[PDB]
Design an enzyme around this catalytic site. Structure first.
Site, PDB file in Angstrom:
ATOM      1  N   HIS B  81       1.144  -1.205   0.319  1.00  0.00           N
ATOM      2  CA  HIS B  81      -0.199  -0.032   0.073  1.00  0.00           C
ATOM      3  C   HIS B  81       0.724   1.316  -0.394  1.00  0.00           C
ATOM      4  CE1 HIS B  81      -2.621  -2.500   1.667  1.00  0.00           C
ATOM      5  NE2 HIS B  81      -3.874  -2.274   1.257  1.00  0.00           N
ATOM      6  N   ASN B 112       7.675  -4.233   3.700  1.00  0.00           N
ATOM      7  CA  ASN B 112       6.324  -4.076   3.830  1.00  0.00           C
ATOM      8  C   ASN B 112       6.045  -3.684   5.366  1.00  0.00           C
ATOM      9  OD1 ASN B 112       3.971  -3.584   3.444  1.00  0.00           O
ATOM     10  ND2 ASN B 112       3.183  -4.853   1.913  1.00  0.00           N
TER      11      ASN B 112
HETATM   12 MG   LIG Z   1       2.141  -1.869   3.762  1.00  0.00          MG
END
Ligand SMILES: [Mg+2]
Ligand SMILES: [Mg+2]
EC number: 3.1.30.-
Lengths: 301, 300
Positions: B81, B112
């Site tokens: 994201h 991440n």
């Molecule tokens: Mg992430």
């Protein structure tokens, strides 16, 4: 949106920039154009605009922080390659000078620039002898290659302090219309060539790709007003897609060298080099040759 | 006769606006160029739950230029994201839109769930001290210098669609104390490699000047910001201090409690924490005891 935009969305600088006889979208991260669109006609490719008066320079409309500079190119091993060719703008000194803005320039292999790409540019101009109007979109590409372990990798050099991106390939999309009133379908072709020396063996159709394939590779949609449900013909079917062969290209190059000769001796190798090349001068060569010969001996020595 | 008779080529870089983020999409690389979001204390609270969300192609992007889950799954790279789903607990719709692949880049799994996550958590922490926080996040593909001095940009492309894996990720943070405060705005720009980083480097070690990031990325951030005005370094007015190993591990172990489904699980988490030489805090034991009673009240 209003809250997110309170201090403005980031700017990408991809807006179309328009000049006398070409338009482009600039890639501020790569310091090269993304695409350059031009319109060609028989009238525009004739005139007294002369390219030896032009200078490469940063586009004055681009923020210097995102501009390329001559120092990035000189000595890099790469030539400054026109996307919109200067040779398409003999009709206008202003228009040709704007093709020397570095916003129209990519790092191009020297042999490709003066060879296969030049011959493609010459074909686009040749099309104006048979189509009243011709549109061309040209630009760089950086395509992936498969590594030894099977992974696909995009790899390209960046040159100079400004990290100008050297493309792996170059593309042209050619759209030709016979006349503004004709009912004949339009003719289109898309081509992708490697940014390297190519030579005379491969025919132009060997580098032809489907428009859809080029759009997927480049992330662009070309000629978006073209109704693709309509009848649009393959330009290599309605026309020749035939570049000049070695004999024709050499005679053309030798003919242009005449006008730059500044000694009777220089003028003599050109014919000598040519003739031994088993290439007989045509009537236009001999006309320009004798004219230049008379001119040279009428000038100070 | 004119050039535009059949249109200029389309680059598709126009800003795309969603419930709580906006982005410009790179159709050639199948990733966003930039993703802008606004964060506040109210927005990061709510009952929106990410376990109900699914990654999917952005329905607004032409399929020929879209990434697909098949490009990412099994590639060795996670779906990262840019606008975090965790910033949108206030709206299930807003959170679902962050799972559009237009908001996603191929991201190292450890990055991440590790350093990038800790940066995301710091941005949320900033809402405790600033009423408004704006964040621009995005990918970068930076060059490396070869032995002969030549500079080469090299990046992997994954899947049939050749989704570009960035070498680095950037964040630009802009914070305003309040709508009525006269205090100057605070800004910071940061660039981190798309790889495992760990706990040794402080966030300021990855800080770059806004001008430097703009040169590298080809972007101009927050163009309405008057840069002749008094603008402060966010790492001078705030801490730019990410959670350390002890704090982050306790945070992760605490979150694992709510997902535990066996008493044996619930005991493993506390055991792991302790072996990590970390003593559970009062919040951990509160959630730990609540889950233990819950698990004893569920079918075995
Ligand atoms: Mg992430
Ligand atoms: Mg050229």
């Amino acid at each position: 949106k209003a809250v997110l935009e309170q201090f403005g969305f980031p700017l990408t600088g991809t807006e179309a920039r328009c000049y006398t006889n070409h338009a482009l979208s600039y890639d501020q991260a790569k310091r090269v154009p993304r695409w350059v669109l031009e319109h060609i006609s028989k009238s525009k490719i004739m005139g007294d605009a002369d390219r030896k008066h032009c200078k490469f320079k940063p586009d004055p409309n681009i923020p210097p922080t995102f501009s390329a500079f001559n120092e990035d190119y000189v000595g890099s091993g790469w030539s400054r390659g026109h996307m919109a060719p200067a040779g398409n703008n003999k009709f206008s000194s202003k228009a040709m000078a704007e093709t020397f803005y570095l916003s129209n320039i990519v790092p191009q292999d020297f042999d490709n620039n003066s060879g296969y790409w030049n011959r493609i540019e010459m074909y686009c101009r040749e099309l104006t002898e048979r189509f009243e109007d011709v549109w061309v979109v040209s630009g760089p590409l950086t395509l992936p290659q498969t590594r030894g372990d099977g992974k696909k990798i995009v790899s390209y050099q960046v040159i100079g302090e400004d990290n100008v991106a050297v493309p792996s390939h170059l593309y042209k999309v050619i759209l030709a219309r016979r006349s503004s009133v004709s009912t004949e379908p339009l003719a289109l072709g898309a081509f992708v060539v490697p940014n390297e020396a190519i030579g005379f063996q491969p025919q132009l159709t060997e580098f032809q790709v489907s428009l859809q394939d080029l759009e997927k590779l480049s992330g662009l949609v070309f000629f978006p007003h073209l109704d693709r449900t309509s009848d649009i013909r393959n330009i290599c079917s309605v026309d020749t897609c035939k570049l000049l062969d070695f004999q024709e290209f050499t005679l053309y190059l030798s003919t242009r060298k005449i006008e730059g000769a500044r000694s009777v001796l220089r003028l003599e190798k050109i014919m000598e080099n040519l003739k031994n090349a088993e290439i007989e001068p045509d009537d236009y060569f001999m006309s320009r040759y004798e004219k230049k010969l008379e001119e040279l001996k009428a000038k100070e020595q």
